[PDB]
Design a protein around this ligand. Sequence first.
Ligand code: HEC
Ligand code: HEC
Length: 112
Amino acid sequence: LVVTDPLTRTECSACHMAYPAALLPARSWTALMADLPNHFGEDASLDEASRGQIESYLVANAADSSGTPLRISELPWFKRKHADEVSPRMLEKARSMSNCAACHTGAERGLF
Ligand code: HEC
Ligand code: HEC
């Protein structure tokens, strides 16, 4: 779906779309939030209080929440579904499978 949390939407849309919490399990969000200085080659670090607040939201709304991958793009379903649907040229043009909006026009609205 859609990141509604203002702090998360603000801090985590700085270099890419704000990935919805529901897309990763809690342990993956915790892992990512624990090493923001070394976040996929970039320094995404935050002040501690903010880090904990964002992490709490992500964990509470995670894929395995009530009611260790680091990438959505490495999940079993993701690999399986995109293998059929994405040409090598589509991938070349989008530059990375992380760039959901290059292919999904409604990504920022939770529409895939
Ligand atoms: C720039 C300084 C960044 C900020 C701030 C945040 N992220 Fe990031 N993220 C960044 C890069 C360079 C990448 C790799 C992109 C690529 O093409 O390989 C990522 C990737 C992610 C991912 C993985 C996407 C995927 O392939 O499935 C996630 C889940 C992610 N980032 C989350 C995330 C969060 C929660 C952030 C705020 C704390 C955040 N990112 C900030 C660069 C930057
Ligand atoms: C182009 C290079 C793409 C990028 C980058 C991402 N996606 Fe994608 N996705 C793409 C296509 C052509 C399709 C098939 C469309 C169809 O209706 O059949 C998809 C499919 C999905 C789906 C649906 C999965 C299913 O159960 O069938 C989802 C949920 C999805 N894509 C999500 C997604 C995310 C989160 C991305 C960034 C991390 C992302 N996609 C990138 C093409 C491309």
